[PDB]
Structure formats: C-alpha cells, structure tokens
Design an enzyme around this catalytic site. Structure first.
Site, mmCIF file in Angstrom:
data_model
loop_
_atom_site.group_PDB
_atom_site.id
_atom_site.type_symbol
_atom_site.label_atom_id
_atom_site.label_comp_id
_atom_site.label_asym_id
_atom_site.label_seq_id
_atom_site.Cartn_x
_atom_site.Cartn_y
_atom_site.Cartn_z
ATOM 1 N N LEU A 60 44.567 35.011 40.929
ATOM 2 C CA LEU A 60 43.101 34.904 41.001
ATOM 3 C C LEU A 60 42.590 35.544 39.834
ATOM 4 C CD1 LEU A 60 41.463 36.059 44.330
ATOM 5 C CD2 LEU A 60 40.188 36.633 42.030
ATOM 6 N N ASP A 61 42.947 36.684 39.366
ATOM 7 C CA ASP A 61 42.404 37.295 38.224
ATOM 8 C C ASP A 61 43.049 36.838 36.698
ATOM 9 O OD1 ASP A 61 41.531 38.476 40.303
ATOM 10 O OD2 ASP A 61 42.063 40.689 39.616
ATOM 11 N N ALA A 62 43.992 36.012 36.694
ATOM 12 C CA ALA A 62 44.410 35.569 35.602
ATOM 13 C C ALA A 62 43.647 35.094 34.476
ATOM 14 C CB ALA A 62 45.710 34.678 35.704
ATOM 15 N N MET A 70 41.160 37.890 33.293
ATOM 16 C CA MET A 70 41.588 38.718 32.169
ATOM 17 C C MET A 70 41.462 38.051 31.000
ATOM 18 S SD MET A 70 41.904 41.213 34.111
ATOM 19 C CE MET A 70 42.333 41.756 36.028
#
Ligand SMILES: [Zn+2]
Lengths: 83, 286, 48, 83
Positions: D59-61, D64
C-alpha cells in the site's frame, strides 16, 4: 521573490489540506469498524481498542511527515535561498 | 489601537535570552525576541506549567500523606476515583509489572487538563493583570501553556525517550534493532533478508518518529485554534456596537460549552496514547 | 408419559413455546434463521 | 529561476499531499477489515496482523517513492541545474 514566496503558501495549504482530508476519511472508516466490533463482541472492547491505536500509527505517518515539511516551509524556506 | 495590533499582541510570548550585550534581559518587541536564538526561554510558559504541576501534586499529596484505609473524606474520595480510573485504564492495555507506567499516566492526564483549563478564563484578564502588577503597557504574557509548540513538544519528546528506553531495557540492543530491521518482513535466504532491511527500516522508522510529533501537534493544534477563536470573538466587542456585542456573547458561550469537551478529551487521548505506545514497546506485536 | 425405567411410566405436562465468545457468519439474516430454527425445535420436542 | 523554484515548491506539496491522502484512506479501508476479522475470530488475530503488515508494504510502496523524490527536490534540485 514574490512568486517563490506566494507559491509556498499554496504549497503549505496542499500539504496540510490533503492530509487533513485523508485522515478525516481514514479515521471515519477505521472507527466505523471499531464501533461495530465493539457491539458484536462487548467483552473484546479493550483488545479492539489497543489494536485500533496500532493501525492509527500507520494511518497518520505520511500525513505527519507533511505537517512537518509544511511548518518547515512556513518559518524557514529552502526555496528562497536558491533566489 | 487596531484589531490587527490587538491580535498581534496576544500571539507573542514573554521571552528572556541573550540580548546584543548580555545574557540577562527580556525582549521588548517580537523581532528582539526572534533575534534570541535556541538559547532562550519563554518565562510565561515555564511560570504557568511549573505552578500548575506543583498545585496538582501538593493537593494529591494532602490526600496520600494521611490516607484513612476506611471511610474517605471529601478530598481523598476524589483523588482515589482518579487513581482507580487511571489504574483501570492501564490494566486494560498493559499486562507487565512496570511501576512507572501508572503514575506517569496520572501525571500526564491531570497536568495537561490543568494547563488546558486556564483557556476558559477570559482572554484579557491575566495579560492585563500582569501588566498592571508590573507597571508596563506593552508586556507580552500568554497564560495557556499548551498553545506553545515548545511546551507540547517537550511533553512528547520526553515520552519518546521513555519509549526508546523501555524498548532497549526489555528487548535488548539486538531486539531494538531487530524490530527496526527484521520486522515486519523476514526470509530464510541471506540475499533476501539483506534486501528487506531497507524496506523494513522505511516502514518501522517512519512510524516511530511520527509518534512524538503527532502527540505534540494534535494537542497544539486543538488548543492554538481554540484560543484564536476566543481572541477573534473578542474583536466583535471592540467595535462598541450593541447588536454585535450581543451576538458575540452567544458565540463565546457556545464556544466555551464546546471547548470544555475538547479540553477534557485532549487530556484523555494524550494519556491513552502514552499507555498504548509504552505498552507496545514491552512485547513483540507482530 | 416419560420412560423412568422398564417398570415405571410417569405422566407429565411439559411447557413448550416459552423457552464460546465468537459469532457465526449468519449467511442469511440471523433473525430469519431464528424464525425457522425455533419451529424445527418445537416439532422435534413433540416428535420426541 | 524564480518560476522553476516556485513551481518546484508546488510539485513537492503535490507529491506528498496526494500520498498522504491515498495512504490515509487506504489504511482506513485495510485496517477497518482487520478489526472486522479480529472481532469474529479473536484466535486468528496474531495471524491476521502478520497478513495485514504484508499488505501494508504494497500500500505505501509508491507513496514512499513519492516522498523520497519530494525531499530530493527540496534539498537538491535537478530542474534548477537544467535551465
Ligand atoms: Zn515483531
């Protein structure tokens, strides 16, 4: 200077405003499941609460990195030093 | 004076620091206070925070130095309802034997509540009483200590030290870096675990640093925006009109009735995140 | 009559209508399931 | 130079602000289903929590990558050296 400084006030309003929008919709989705879980299992309320506050740390991390760079742009300025 | 000048004066702190010639003096203007660097002190923040903390512990000591163990007097009945409420709040989250977590939660809840409660007293009373007692007409003096980002950052950077402390004290130096680099993703293959360390470090490190900042800025944002609305409603009375100094009373009353709920709730959230964040530093949650 | 033992049958009057911390998924409505299960329970008591 | 540096401040706010908005809503959705599962199967909670953190990485790949490029555009600037 007048544009680099005036386009930093719009930058600040998008860093705090888009984060304010996503955290109020995210905690309203997360919290809507916590209150139903608290009804389905009245004895699990203290466990569901500690697990909800673990998710809350993941939910607000990127929003809090943005309230910091926005405050850093409001009282210091990494762009004005580049003329 | 102007409405802009009235608002500009209420947002300045009583700063004391290194003047152009000597480490002994109070700044007389906002610019002379911004010249004073990181080696300065807001004397109104430290004068309200320390005085209210000592009033709280002195009153709680008066009901602890002579505890009856039987029928309680009016004072100790209240103090025990607070200790029983905090102990229950800690036992529903923390299962260990640590003796610091319970008195810390009581200190955090009662102190923050008192630092926030002074916002209900009228906004010009304390600023003018300080000026009349001192003999000046340009004295900067802010009563509500939780409206200063340094006061709220001090309260969270200190809880963060206790989090990094207890995490190393019970998991060991290896266990601290282990949760920071081998969690949440682990693999048997040596090439894979090395390629997962940067990914694990980005996920875990960001969440850890966000804890103290979110605790300080949630408290600062609700109190700074709370006093700003009271200062702005006071300018409606500065107009001198009748049908405006009547509408202002309704907004001030409605805002104070709403603010007592916020003042009570912000102290509870800071206590609960202090209990939760210190309890998840004592066990491997994954 | 109730079968107490091979030598004893006891006549009785028994009431019918006026009758672990996890929940089921209840595919159809839990209220609908109850409205159906209770009818099967009374019939099973009468059959027994 | 004042237009490139001023537009860079907005580019940086847009990178982090959209990432904050996306991850806050994404974790509200993911975490809401974790509390729903935790209430029905309190025995499965330690297994569900490991599976939730596997998804949290996906989800945060991209978010970031966005904040990494945003910080890079503030402390360095690949556009100012191209004018
Ligand atoms: Zn772990």
């Amino acid at each position: 200077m007048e544009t680099v400084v005036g386009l930093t006030a719009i930058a600040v309003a998008l860093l705090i405003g888009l984060g304010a929008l996503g955290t109020a919709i995210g905690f309203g989705l997360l919290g809507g499941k916590f209150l139903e879980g608290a009804a389905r299992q009245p004895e699990m309320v203290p466990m569901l609460q500690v697990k909800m506050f673990i998710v809350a740390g993941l939910l607000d991390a990127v929003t809090m990195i943005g309230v910091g760079i926005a405050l850093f742009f409001t009282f210091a300025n990494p762009f004005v030093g580049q003329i | 004076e102007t409405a802009s000048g009235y608002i500009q004066h209420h947002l300045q702190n009583l700063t004391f620091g290194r003047l152009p010639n000597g480490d002994w003096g109070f700044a007389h203007t906002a610019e002379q206070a911004k010249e004073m660097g990181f080696w300065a002190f807001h004397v109104d923040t430290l004068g309200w925070s320390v005085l209210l903390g000592v009033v709280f512990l002195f009153i709680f000591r008066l009901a602890a130095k002579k505890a009856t163990s039987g029928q309680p007097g009016g004072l100790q009945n209240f103090v025990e309802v607070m200790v029983e409420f905090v102990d229950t709040s800690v036992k529903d989250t923390f299962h260990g034997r640590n003796p610091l977590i319970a008195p810390l939660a009581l200190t955090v809840f009662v102190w923050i509540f008192l630092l926030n409660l002074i916002d209900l007293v009228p906004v010009d009373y304390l600023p003018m009483l300080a000026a009349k007692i001192t003999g000046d007409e340009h004295l900067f003096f802010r009563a509500v200590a939780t409206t200063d980002p340094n006061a709220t950052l001090g309260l969270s950077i200190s809880v963060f030290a206790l989090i990094v402390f207890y995490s190393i004290k019970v998991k060991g130096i290896g266990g601290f870096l282990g949760e920071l680099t081998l969690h949440p993703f682990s693999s048997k293959n040596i090439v894979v675990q090395i390629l997962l360390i940067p990914v694990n470090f980005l996920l875990e490190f960001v969440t850890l640093i966000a804890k103290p900042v979110s605790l300080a800025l949630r408290l600062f944002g609700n109190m700074y925006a709370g006093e700003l609305i009271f200062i702005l409603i006071a300018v409606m009375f500065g107009s001198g009109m009748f049908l405006l100094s009547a509408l202002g009373v309704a907004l001030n009353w409605a805002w104070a009735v709403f603010h007592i709920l916020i003042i009570t709730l912000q102290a509870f959230i800071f206590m609960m995140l202090t209990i939760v964040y210190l309890s998840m530093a004592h066990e491997d949650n994954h | 009559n109730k079968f107490v033992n091979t030598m004893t049958q006891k006549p009785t009057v028994e009431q019918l209508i006026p009758l672990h911390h996890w929940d089921y998924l209840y595919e159809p409505d839990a209220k609908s399931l109850l409205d159906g299960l209770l009818v099967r329970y009374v019939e099973s008591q009468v059959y027994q």
